[PDB]
């Protein structure tokens, strides 16, 4: 059988949110840390 198209679409919005989240989690402000001294 397989999925339902509701679950397919819900899965696709989770693709949207998941990829945007994990693209956020790879930090690159060209400086991750900054030591005070």
């Amino acid at each position: 059988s397989g999925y339902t198209p509701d679950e397919k679409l819900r899965l696709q919005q989770l693709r949207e949110l998941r990829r945007r989240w994990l693209k956020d989690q790879e930090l690159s402000p060209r400086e991750p840390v900054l030591p005070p001294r």
């Binding site: 989690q25 790879e26 930090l27 690159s28 991750p32």
Partner: protein
Amino acid sequence: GKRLFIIKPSGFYDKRFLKLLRFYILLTGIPVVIGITLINVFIGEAELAEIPEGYVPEHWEYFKHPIS
């Protein structure tokens, strides 16, 4: 570019407590050990005479270490 962002619970409270603990033992850790060093390097511990002819001491003068 390559690296992810690690998750940490907290660091500030713990590092603060450890620096406060070592520092507020260090505040009278160093002067006390330098004091006991200057005591056993300047004034002497004692030596081991016997009781002379009818000279009764106080309750002290029976102990090795001078701060004792």
